[PDB]
Symmetry: C3
Subunit: 155 residues, 3 copies
C-alpha cells in the first residue's frame, strides 16, 4: 500500500508528476502533438497505464488553467480499478465554428502561436504539443456494495 504502479507505453510518454506536496492531483502529459479545429473531438493518448487498486477510482480530469483560458473541454474520465490499458484524455474543442479564418493557431494558454511558415487555420483552432500538462489524475476511495431491490426504503 501507499504505492501506485505506472507503466510507460512509449518513449513519447512522461511519468505523471505532482505539483506540490499538499496537492491532490497527478498532472498528466500528452504523448502526441494534436491540432483540434472548432467543434472537433479526440481521445488524446497519454501512453501511460496505471494499476488502481480495488476500492478506488481514478478521475482523469481537466486543469483549471487550461479550461478557464481556452475552449478545450476535457470530460472527466472514471478510471476503473484493474484497467491497465492506455489512459485516453477525452477532449473536445468547444469553440464555435463561425466560418472565419486566421493565420494563428492557439496554444493551451489561449496565446497566438507565431510561426515562420504561413498557414491558414479555422478561427478558434488549438494545438496541443507533445508533452504538455493538459490534465490531472485524482484518485478517491469508492463504496461498492451489493444492490438489494426493495418496494420501499427503510426510512
Amino acid at each position: 500500500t501507499n504505492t501506485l504502479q505506472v507503466k510507460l507505453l512509449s518513449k513519447n510518454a512522461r511519468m505523471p508528476e505532482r505539483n506540490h506536496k499538499t496537492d491532490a492531483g497527478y498532472d498528466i502529459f500528452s504523448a502526441e502533438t494534436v491540432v483540434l479545429e472548432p467543434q472537433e473531438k479526440a481521445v488524446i493518448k497519454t501512453d501511460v497505464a496505471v494499476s488502481i487498486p480495488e476500492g478506488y477510482v481514478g478521475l482523469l480530469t481537466s486543469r483549471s488553467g487550461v479550461s478557464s483560458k481556452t475552449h478545450l473541454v476535457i470530460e472527466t474520465g472514471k478510471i476503473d480499478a484493474g484497467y491497465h490499458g492506455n489512459l485516453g484524455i477525452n477532449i473536445k474543442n468547444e469553440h464555435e465554428d463561425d466560418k472565419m479564418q486566421t493565420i494563428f493557431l492557439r496554444n493551451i494558454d489561449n496565446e497566438k502561436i507565431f510561426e515562420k511558415e504561413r498557414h491558414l487555420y479555422k478561427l478558434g483552432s488549438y494545438r496541443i504539443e507533445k508533452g504538455e500538462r493538459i490534465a490531472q489524475l485524482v484518485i478517491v476511495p469508492i463504496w461498492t456494495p451489493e444492490l438489494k431491490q426493495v418496494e420501499e426504503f427503510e426510512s
Copy 2:
C-alpha cells in the same frame, strides 16, 4: 452496511448493473426513448431511486464510450444522501446547429439509424432508446464538517 437499496419506479426501469467485479461504477439505463436535436437539453428519466447512506455521495456521470463517440454531454449529478426521488440524467446534445438536414438519426455509438419509413431530421440529432447504457453511478465517501469563520487560517 455493504448494501444499497434500489427502488424501481416503473416497468420501464431496469436494475443498475456493474460491468465487472473490479469496476467502480454501476451502469444506469434510460426509462424512455428520446430524440435530442442539436443544442437541445433534457433531464432523461431513469425511473430508479436509491437510498445513499449518510457520509456518502453518488456521482451520476457519463460513460467514456458514449461521451467520446457522440456530442451527448451528461453533466455529472451530485446525488445527495437521503434523496429517494427519481434519478434524472442531466443531458444536452452539444452538436452544433449548422442548419442542415439528413434522413439519418444517430445512435449513442455515433452510427446511422437506418429505417424503412423516411423522415427528415436536423443534422447532429441523436436518439436514445428505452433501456440503453448512457450513464453510470459511482459512490464515494464525503467529509461534512462544521464551518468555522476565521479572519486568518492557522497555517
Copy 3:
C-alpha cells in the same frame, strides 16, 4: 478535526451554506453581478477562501437546478489542500450564438428578466446577480501514494 476554516475576503462574500443535514454539498454564492453573452467565458469570484486539510480534495461543482434549466456550464474545480486563495467558479455560457437580439436577459432559472429601462441583448444571454446559489462544494478524501515505475504490473 470535523472543522473547516472559511475566510471571507469581502463584504460581498457570503458564508457557504448546507441545504439539509443529510446533504453532501455546501452551496456557494457569487460575489459579483455578471452578464454572460452566448459563448462567453468567465472565472466568477466567490470571495471565499477555505483551508481543506491534507488527504482531502474539494469539488467546486454545478448545481442540478441551474445546469438543467440554463446553458450555464460550470467546469468542476479540483480544490487542492492548502489552497487559501479566492475560489473562482469556472463558468461558460454554452448557449449558441445565432446572431439574434432580444430585450430580455435570462436569470439562472431560465426566466425572463423584466426591467423598466429597455436594453437590447444577444439572445441566450444570462445574468447572475450578487449572492446567488450557482455552485456547490463537495469535499471527498483522496489517495496520494508514491509512484513506482514498472515494466509490467504485478497482476
